[PDB]
Design a protein around this ligand. Sequence first.
Ligand code: HEM
Ligand code: HEM
Ligand code: HEM
Ligand code: FMX
Ligand code: FES
Lengths: 60, 147, 377, 240, 78, 79
Amino acid sequence: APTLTARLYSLLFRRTSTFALTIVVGALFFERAFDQGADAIYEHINEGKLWKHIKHKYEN
Amino acid sequence: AAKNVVSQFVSSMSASADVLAMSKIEIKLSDIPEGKNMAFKWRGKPLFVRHRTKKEIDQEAAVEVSQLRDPQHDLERVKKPEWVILIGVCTHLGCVPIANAGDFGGYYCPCHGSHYDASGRIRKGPAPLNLEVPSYEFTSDDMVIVG
Amino acid sequence: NIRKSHPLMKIVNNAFIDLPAPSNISSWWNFGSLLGICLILQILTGLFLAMHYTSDTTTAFSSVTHICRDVNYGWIIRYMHANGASMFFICLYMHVGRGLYYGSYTFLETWNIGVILLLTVMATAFMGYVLPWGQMSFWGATVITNLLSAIPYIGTNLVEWIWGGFSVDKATLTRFFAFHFILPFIIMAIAMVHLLFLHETGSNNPTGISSDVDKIPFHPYYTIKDILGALLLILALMLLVLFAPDLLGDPDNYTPANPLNTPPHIKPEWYFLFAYAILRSIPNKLGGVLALAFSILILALIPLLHTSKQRSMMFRPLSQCLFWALVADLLTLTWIGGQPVEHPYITIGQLASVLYFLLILVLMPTAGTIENKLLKW
Amino acid sequence: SDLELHPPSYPWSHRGLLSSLDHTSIRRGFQVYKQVCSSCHSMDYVAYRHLVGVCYTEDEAKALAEEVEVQDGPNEDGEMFMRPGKLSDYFPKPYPNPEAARAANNGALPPDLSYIVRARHGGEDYVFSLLTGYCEPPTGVSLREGLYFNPYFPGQAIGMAPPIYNEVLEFDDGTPATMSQVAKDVCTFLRWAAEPEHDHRKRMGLKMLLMMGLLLPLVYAMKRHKWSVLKSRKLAYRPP
Amino acid sequence: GDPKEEEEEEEELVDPLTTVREQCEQLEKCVKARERLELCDERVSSRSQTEEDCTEELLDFLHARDHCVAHKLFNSLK
Amino acid sequence: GRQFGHLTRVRHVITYSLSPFEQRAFPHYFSKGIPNVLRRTRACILRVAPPFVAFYLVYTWGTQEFEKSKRKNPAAYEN
Ligand code: HEM
Ligand code: HEM
Ligand code: HEM
Ligand SMILES: C[C@@]1(c2ccc(Oc3ccccc3)cc2)OC(=O)N(Nc2ccccc2)C1=O
Ligand code: FES
């Protein structure tokens, strides 16, 4: 039983190759998860959007 | 934060208001002479049309597909033979082709040099693609639109 | 491999990596690099705004709105520019204050170059502000330009010359666009010359005592200290852009052109307030503009008035009190410069104006002399 | 003459830090510009497409644009006719050369358009309180001609006839076109006409504090790490 | 009084700003300003030829009214 | 410029130091920092603060006079 940060260090941080690979792969997900999670926060507090407003007009 | 602000700054150089025009200019084309060439704008981009005289039909009724770079036949190109509906830019660079001045059909992009015909499709030079005139729909024999 | 030999990286290394710097420079020292960031900020956004702005009298106000409504993200770029101009002054002010308090002006050349850099950016921001051809842009342009008319004998040929006509019109908006585009490149060159003279001695520090016995490399230390501080400059800039776009921005520039009608109470941008109050104080044309010029041109007299045997004000209780009285006085000038020329205000405004000069030209130097005596030096 | 009062207190639903607009109220507000304000005030910078995003629908935007006639470009004769109504250039311009608005309204020039932020301190409120606050002209002061009196405005006196409560309506919903309700909507809409970016900006703005709240502590910790070595260093002087 | 005339009161048209103004126009600091106004409102009727204005005494009153107008109002609107 | 190796002469001082990966970046951040800021505050209030309250007092007075003098005014014109 080593620790987490240790595992992370051994497998990914030691080399600048992996270190860099890990962060670019980290940004790809962070951006996607931050945008989503953050939009939903923006929406939940508002709700006088163009969204809910739409619902009213699938017609023409 | 870096690609967000770099994207925004980059996306700013893309077009701004421009989601263009209506066009469809009411065209009467059994109105214009036997076979003269007419050009309008459909978003500020020259659209040129000749009629399609008897003698002129068959120069394009005799095509050739077995030796091309893009596929078709004039009659197979548009919906009705003696009635085609061209645009007018040139797939090479952006030199607007002139009315029946070169070889084959009529077309001929100068700006340097390249050929086309009455169907427009490129046959001789530097340009890689056939040009493009959206659809061709008239409405009735006497009237017309574009696309 | 080596940073030291390559004719190019050698400059970089000697400026940002191996430069020996005081172990003890404070947050107050972060502003010079923030002024550099400001200049670059102004340069990038400035440029992208130039890809869409048009310099003709008619479409000027309009093209700017084209940017804020039509051009993708123009609004964010436009606000960063405007709010970047304010930050730039915030930084100038701190930077110049830091130099006064800590005696940094004793580096003659680099301080003198700084004054030039100060006037250059003020010239730059002025031309900038006129660009959208709003009411204040126009009247502000009219006020400031007319200062030159006070100059004896050649005053009017000069304003008309700078106008390219009989008043701020067509010709002026176009030339101001031009000069406003080139000035920041010229600023950039002066700043490199500023940095050159500074490296000759290296940085000063809070104590005013030589740090050659305790130098550290600019690189790991000030590299990160500067990064952290850039992010702070950024937060403060975004807060404005993203929560308070119009806060420092006068509502009247949101209304086009009126060479016929001057707004009721025209109000300078913010960073001109204190100087505006000084100019206004004195009811005289010539003397106002003279007082105005002197109010800024005084920085270059500062070094002659150093009187203390110590460099910094860190060990100088008297000078410290007078320094803040100076700051408090400037803050008063600011308040007053943004107020109507009337009863309580003109008198307050005249007393603050004598105080500013009274404390720089006489109070500070006398404090220094009594601090020396108190110490038996 | 030189005396005057300032606007009340703003409870808008677009006043706080993060705070969208009630896009339904932006609708109603356009309707107010459409039927009432339009006949006097030019709104030179907005267009039918701009609404597509905000209050209407693609198809709806076209339809509303089609209810007017602009002066379309010349054809072969060197003409100048009229056309159904695009979707690409609002511009119902009530008056040609501005002086025509002066002639009609009598001196007074019906100003600007996409209002607030515009030259009016206390933007939306000033307007709301201007429209909603017409009142009886108190004793001692006459009005050179029955101009029109308004407690707010600069100089309490001048210009525009009180155009609110002539209960024009076409609010679908089932919303009572009352004095106030029509004003709240018109100011709300005018807010969006002056600042269309308003909602995106605060969503970004959110992200800026959220990101800054991550990065600030982190970058700070990076600097302390590297500065550790100096902060805890120990000195000793050992002369002969 | 009576329902059919309530929708007619809705067609004769309705109250928003009025019920709130009336209710605020009613209040402490307000009646005080109105009272200061009413008094000055009289001293100009007095010499109804040759004399000043009463613009100022009016402004004070709106200030107090519209203030509590803004606080309370909007809750009713929609 | 000047380079490490040619700055100045130092004799007899020892500097002991630790690796960043061996120490904390925030040891007693609050335990020792708060007291420290209180102390730097005390050390400078008397010089920094007074000029500003002086401006503050003139700020409130000044505006007070402005309002009462011009607007509010129209005091007596009695006949
Ligand atoms: C419709 C609901 C409407 C609104 C809203 C509106 C707004 C408005 C503002 C905000 C002003 C600004 C006051 C100022 O500049 O400080 C203003 C001014 C004038 N208006 Fe208006 N207006 C609306 C409608 C109309 C209508 C239908 C008319 C014509 C009858 C009209 C007229 C005027 C005039 C004249 C002015 C100028 C006031 C002045 O400076 O003398 N408005 N309006
Ligand atoms: C790279 C050189 C620069 C260029 C090309 C540039 C370009 C422009 C343009 C096109 C405008 C008009 C558009 C608008 O108003 O938004 C403008 C306005 C302005 N710029 Fe610059 N600028 C430059 C450097 C500066 C500098 C050094 C400053 C001073 C910090 C500055 C501060 C301003 C200001 C205050 C305005 C008026 C802003 C407003 O309120 O609209 N810019 N600039
Ligand atoms: C374009 C405007 C300016 C830029 C880009 C600029 C840039 C810098 C930089 C990078 C430093 C290095 C360290 C530090 O942050 O302090 C510095 C130091 C200094 N600058 Fe500037 N500065 C500018 C305006 C000024 C002004 C207006 C003055 C004075 C009128 C000035 C005089 C000095 C002095 C005296 C120092 C000495 C450093 C010290 O004593 O601590 N500079 N500047
Ligand atoms: C932004 C601004 C400006 C910019 C730079 C300036 O340069 C100085 C700043 C401080 C001290 C001296 C000059 C001064 C004003 O440009 C401008 O038109 N104004 N507006 C203005 C309003 C009233 C009188 C005079 C000017 C500015 O504030
Ligand atoms: S662009 Fe037409 S031949 Fe080159």
